[PDB]
Amino acid sequence: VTTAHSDYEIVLEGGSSSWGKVKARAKVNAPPASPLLPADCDVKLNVKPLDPAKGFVRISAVFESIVDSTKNKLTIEADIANETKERRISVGEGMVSVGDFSHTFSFEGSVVNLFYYRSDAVRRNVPNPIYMQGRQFHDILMKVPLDNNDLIDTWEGTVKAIGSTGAFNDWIRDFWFIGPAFTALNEGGQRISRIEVNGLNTESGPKGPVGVSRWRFSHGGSGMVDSISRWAELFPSDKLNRPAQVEAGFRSDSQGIEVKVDGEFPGVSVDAGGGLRRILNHPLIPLVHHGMVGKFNNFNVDAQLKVVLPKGYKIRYAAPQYRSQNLEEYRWSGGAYARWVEHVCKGGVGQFEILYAQ
Amino acid sequence: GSNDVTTAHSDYEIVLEGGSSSWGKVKARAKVNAPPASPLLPADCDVKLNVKPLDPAKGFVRISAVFESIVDSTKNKLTIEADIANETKERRISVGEGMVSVGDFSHTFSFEGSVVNLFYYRSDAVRRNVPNPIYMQGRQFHDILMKVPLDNNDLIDTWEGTVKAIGSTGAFNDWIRDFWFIGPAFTALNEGGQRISRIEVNGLNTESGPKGPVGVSRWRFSHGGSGMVDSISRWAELFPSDKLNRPAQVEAGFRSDSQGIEVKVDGEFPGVSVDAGGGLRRILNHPLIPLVHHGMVGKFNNFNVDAQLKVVLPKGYKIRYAAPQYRSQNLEEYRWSGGAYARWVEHVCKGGVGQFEILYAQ
Amino acid sequence: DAAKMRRFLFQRTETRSTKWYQIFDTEKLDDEQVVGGHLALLGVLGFIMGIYYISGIQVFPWGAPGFHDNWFYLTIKPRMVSLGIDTYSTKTADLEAAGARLLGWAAFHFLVGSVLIFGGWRHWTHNLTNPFTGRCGNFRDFRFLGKFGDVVFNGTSAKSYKEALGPHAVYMSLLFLGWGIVMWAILGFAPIPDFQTINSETFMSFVFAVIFFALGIYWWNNPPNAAIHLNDDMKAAFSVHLTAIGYINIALGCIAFVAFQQPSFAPYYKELDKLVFYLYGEPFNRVSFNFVEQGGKVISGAKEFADFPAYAILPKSGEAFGMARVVTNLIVFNHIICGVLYVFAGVYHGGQYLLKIQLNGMYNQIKSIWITKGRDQEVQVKILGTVMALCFATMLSVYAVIVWNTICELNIFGTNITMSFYWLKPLPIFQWMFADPSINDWVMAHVITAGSLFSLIALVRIAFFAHTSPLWDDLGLKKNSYSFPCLGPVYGGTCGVSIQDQLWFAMLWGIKGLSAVCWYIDGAWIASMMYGVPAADAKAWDSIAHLHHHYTSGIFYYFWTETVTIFSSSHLSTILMIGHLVWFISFAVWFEDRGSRLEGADIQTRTIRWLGKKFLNRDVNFRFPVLTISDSKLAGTFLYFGGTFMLVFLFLANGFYQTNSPLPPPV
Ligand code: BCL
Ligand code: BCL
Ligand code: BCL
Ligand code: BCL
Ligand code: G2O
Ligand SMILES: CCCCCCCCCCCCCCCC(=O)OC[C@H](COP(=O)(O)OC[C@@H](O)CO)OC(=O)CCCCCCCCCCCCCCC
Ligand code: SF4
Ligand SMILES: [Ca+2]
């Protein structure tokens, strides 16, 4: 058996608005590839524009999880804005808690994404470029009060390791990618440069010592890397005229995965030229990353996709072909759509573009 | 019970040449009812490779390759012409010219190339004990002198960006590999054993040529193989210039789609068969890289492929030790279908390297 | 204001429109809605089968005169006699039992059809909740029935249509086994492999139950791939199955024609010639102009016969009126015309889907052979050209043979019947499939081939030129509506190029090759147009060609003979009038006159508005609508095809009159 149930929905908006409701649920009768089971996780991404004057948006992310009966939590606030086309700045704070341990962090980081080439020959010839190589340069200043004994011990051990072990710059990449994260790094085309630590220090804060870490790293991609290949597409701050929230989670026991995701955010529909909008090109990193875990079991799939177009809009060239058009909402199920769903669950990055106009 | 079917059909034919010749007609048709892993679809491609012997005095062969493709209604084309010769057993020299065109853009190039293949060892103990050495670790040393006329405004822009990037960034020598292997090409490097070393740029100088500025690129790079790479381990066997006594052509092309792939392959070239001792000849060992490269793209849809293979031996020859065993033989030609052969076909379509060797003698 | 009018004739325009006759179009229907519609229609089918069974009552066992005979029940009476539910019994005692059985089966059909309709309604509303348990079933993933739904189909209900073929075949195996056990228990008829009795039907029902179960297992565990029908199964799979059912239905008509004449079918069809039938609307006992009731005995105005009081329907024998082959021909031609229509409709709906995928570029994105063949634009031209050439050759040869036969009959140009094609019979290796093989059967085979190829021309034009044709490729044009009637008088005119109009032309062309069946199954000597006519030599066919039977009359004289009985009855006469009326009205919409109708309707609107003011008062804002050429062609095809086949029925239902006595030469 191992049948895969999944329902996807897309409720779009017309005109210049690119917003769209995305809510999906999924049932898989297969064991998840987690060495600690069962694993449950809840994530809530809420974004609201602080000041539309120059791009401040307050993005909040809470990751509540329970893996093998230990309670995990990771809340992070961040005011992210674009200083320019290629540079982004994020200021905020956060908290991570595992079991009875919890350490609060604050950060001021800037990410600079640079494409290797900006050729107009490719841009004018390829209307829908997918692969786009480049690098991002993360310049992060993260601060953590050292009030726990475990925190102080971690800080002292890290300081000693950097002082003594000179290979820390590239040996941190082994620790920093837990388990299969390192393999996923190369699977998705990513590669991390050696970090460079611009300084570690501690000082008496509001109530005690705080570990201030000024460090820098950069990672580059060959085209699949959706953080790099599409830098401004992943962060639609300009078209965020109202609060956006995403609630997702999964209940993944030892004999099945129970996926649930909601969503309301801009950038769901992007113009493809000639007055023809489209569903945003599917991110490649999620597909190539899930393909390592989605290839472990032979599974039948009954996947259904709702695409509710706005009033008067019509889909032209949905491929795989949609099953049943109903007024202004469309359905995909079985046939080539089921084959494509299996293809992208197992690891494929095949194109399923839904062009539509009014 | 059952699963998703997503059937795929394919036919293969091998028509071998008699005597001591290693020639053989190779054609392969295939049709897969599964979505390809191309983020831009449809992606159609037509390929033509032709080689003719320039002269047997020092083993130059005139090799041409035309790749004309359309991806998402973007008509891509890349034509090359090259004169390649083995000046020794470890070093190859190639001089030739070509062009690449994408939509409106197009730029030609002329390259002076030298590839040097070094195995890490040449121990006689391995040679005298392993009759069929498959893995053979080694390094390929590429030295390329390519000249591109910078006539388009985009070519001049590419030059200005590159020469400004090399002098301003010291990490160009290794960050060039990220742009170089676009998308899955970088990931496919490691899953084939390839290691691309940092390229050394010996100099980017521009000078006026016959018609204007000509960007000259003198750069070297070396890619290493774990024995898993055919361009390194099987370097001598992939360039049968000594056995090219007549023009050889390979015309291929695939029609990739939103819900399928259609493949045509037509070939006529030497090196289809090699020796195995005592008059016993075998079809060449299957190249490793294509199998383990299609494997990382051909494991996304469950399929029950039905494949038929046809091997037409020359007169007087009989197959000995075909494994998996041939399904039928018409007293001069042999035929594979279903049974253990279809299992091996699925194995290699998913990336397996299960040895399916065919030996024959007269 | 000249604009308020303009968005009145901008309401029937053949742009993309609602088109009320497309409310149940499969584009807006899902799989479960199709299941529910089919279940509800099968329930209504059970309702009408019960109604027919009721119409089959002749004694009403509770005690009353029964129903008069009608074609709705006469076309199924041989089957019910075969099943033992009705009788060819001469006595009331054994006919009360038949009436009771038919009443019980009608009530059973009413109950089962009500259940089926309710289930189809719940499928239509996506409401698979069990009211007794309160749960809800899942259409995508359901256990079929229970433990049986787990030993086979181990959970995992079919998610795709190619995956549904197998469970469907197992369902049909269940249907075959259920019909076999219904035979064995309720209807007696133990399964004996004696292929001359109805017991063989039960035996072959069990055999087909086993075959269908094994095949369903195989296709459940090894689903086949037509690939493309999986996606738009609403129109692709539906149309492919529609043309498959059309061919199956033509085959079933042929099976019926062959079987119903066999000795094994004698007690069910041939024995209908020993009965007397009292059909509704047939000649009734007439009375004079001064009938004053007072029954028991007529006083003033004696009727035609002292028996059959008042206005009773007169008896007609089953031997002079060949009710055996009349019912056989009715069934056979019904299934043959339904098969031809289903083939045409399957080709048309497939062309609809195929144009839909040509417009969005999915046409080039098909991998299955069934489209990668015709995606050539030259193999299309070669195929259509060779079909047209074969049609031209066959039709020209057979028509010239028929015309020469008619000339030799009438002795035009001083010819003679010995100059005719009386010698042109089927080969002795082909004479086994005809009784009394002659030039008539040769002409029938060649006319069937010619008409089939003639309709195949338009079917191929639907299949290939749904979006573009080599003419319209050479011109700067493309078809993108499947229902647009024209682009105008440009290039001298572009009428009827869409696949809808090609469907209409296929129907009109198949009218000839299909009515040729009506002539044949009635024995009407299509080998010439004037047969049995006493003009010069048309009565010499029976002697010159050594015929064994004596067919009715030639193609043209067929409207003289055997119309002696259509005219003899009031019901067939009024059917003739209604059919002709409906038929010629199709000229009002096929003739290139739609704009004339629009102009005249504007004139009539202005008249009625003016006539509503000069004599009447108040606003007369109503305006006359004119069917557009898309609607005009749809309505015209319906009117034409119905008008001709309401009277082909009259040829079929007026009697056989194909006596087995070849009349001697005129000498
Ligand atoms: C993931 C691939 C790249 C990466 C690509 C990016 C991109 C792209 C960005 C950053 C940005 C930042 N990166 Mg980085 N970055 C990576 C690895 C890291 C690591 C680490 C220890 O590995 C660190 C500390 C950082 C640190 C930082 C901070 C300076 C900043 C984000 C803070 C914030 O948003 O918090 C809150 C944390 C989150 C919101 C967690 C949720 C993250 C996931 C990927 C978001 C999915 C969005 C979902 C698909 C749809 C969202 C809809 C809702 C409306 C939000 N990056 C990896 C290597 N990084 C941002 C920036 O520009 O800062 C100036 C930015 O836009
Ligand atoms: C970007 C990473 C997040 C973070 C995410 C986590 C997660 C996830 C976990 C911890 C956990 C712990 N955290 Mg913390 N933690 C951060 C910042 C800090 C800092 C600091 C000075 O900034 C300190 C001292 C600590 C201390 C501690 C460790 C003592 C403790 C358990 C060991 C462990 O593996 O930690 C992980 C240590 C790191 C990922 C960062 C260590 C930072 C060092 C001390 C200073 C920076 C060195 C170098 C310049 C940065 C290299 C890049 C990092 C690898 C990303 N965290 C930053 C904000 N932390 C555990 C916990 O919460 O409950 C058990 C755990 O599972
Ligand atoms: C593919 C694996 C290795 C590789 C292995 C080789 C091998 C092996 C050779 C070269 C050779 C060359 N390589 Mg190198 N080389 C690679 C990557 C590169 C790259 C790059 C940007 O990535 C470049 C610029 C070069 C540049 C060059 C030139 C120096 C030189 C001749 C090129 C030419 O004639 O085209 C030739 C290319 C084609 C004709 C296109 C078709 C390519 C495929 C691989 C051929 C398939 C053959 C088919 C299976 C059977 C054909 C039979 C018919 C008879 C033709 N290589 C990769 C890393 N390279 C040749 C040499 O030695 O020059 C001295 C040579 O023999
Ligand atoms: C070895 C690769 C082939 C080649 C194959 C392609 C392909 C394929 C494409 C282009 C395309 C373009 N080519 Mg070119 N092109 C080559 C040689 C050149 C040279 C040069 C001085 O030699 C220049 C200026 C250009 C210029 C251009 C870019 C301006 C343009 C669009 C951006 C792009 O992706 O570039 C690609 C740039 C490179 C692959 C080589 C750039 C060479 C630089 C300037 C000088 C060498 C630097 C370094 C020492 C060598 C690095 C090796 C490469 C990483 C493989 N080409 C060589 C012969 N070129 C695009 C096109 O044609 O239509 C859109 C495209 O898709
Ligand atoms: C049955 C035969 C026909 C009519 C009855 C008729 C009626 C009609 N036709 Mg016609 N017609 C053809 C047959 C008939 N066309 C053919 C075979 C062709 C192809 C050559 C054809 C062609 C054109 C063109 C080109 C034009 C018209 C028109 C035009 C209108 C004129 C308006 C008028 O003066 O009133 C005249 C209208 C009447 C006298 C109708 C009175 C009812 C009566 C008792 C007959 C009963 C109708 C029917 C028999 C019963 C069915 C009823 C149902 C309940 C079962 C008017 C409605 C014109 C207009 O629409 O506008 C002027 C126009 O341009 N035609
Ligand atoms: C004062 C001025 C005069 C004012 C009054 C004049 C207008 C009065 C006209 C009234 C009666 C019209 C005369 C008839 C009009 C006439 O004969 O023309 C045919 C008519 C088309 O007419 P037009 O729309 O072009 O114009 C008529 C105009 O009068 C107004 O529309 O309608 C049809 O096509 C009938 C088909 C309807 C759809 C039925 C399809 C078949 C259904 C099944 C039936 C067959 C069963 C199958 C068998 C094969
Ligand atoms: S006569 Fe009528 S159908 Fe023909 S082209 Fe003109 S408007 Fe169109
Ligand atoms: Ca008759």
Automatic annotation (TrEMBL), chain C:
Record-listed bacteriochlorophyll a 28 binding positions: 143
Residues that hold bacteriochlorophyll a 2 according to the record: 22, 24, 349, 352
Binding of bacteriochlorophyll a 8, residues: 38, 168
Binding-site residues, bacteriochlorophyll a 41: 369
Residues that hold bacteriochlorophyll a 17 according to the record: 52, 334
Binding site for bacteriochlorophyll a 9: 38, 241
Residue numbers binding bacteriochlorophyll a 40: 335
Binding site for bacteriochlorophyll a 19: 53, 79, 109
Binding site for bacteriochlorophyll a 34: 168, 241
Binding site for bacteriochlorophyll a 1: 22-24
Residues at which bacteriochlorophyll a 35 binds: 168
UniProt: bacteriochlorophyll a 3 binding residues: 23-24, 348-349, 352
Residues engaged in binding bacteriochlorophyll a 16: 52, 334
Binding site for bacteriochlorophyll a 29: 123, 130, 142
Protein name per Swiss-Prot or TrEMBL: Photosystem P840 reaction center, large subunit
Biological source species: Chlorobaculum tepidum (strain ATCC 49652 / DSM 12025 / NBRC 103806 / TLS) (Chlorobium tepidum)
Lineage of the organism: Bacteria, Pseudomonadati, Chlorobiota, Chlorobiia, Chlorobiales
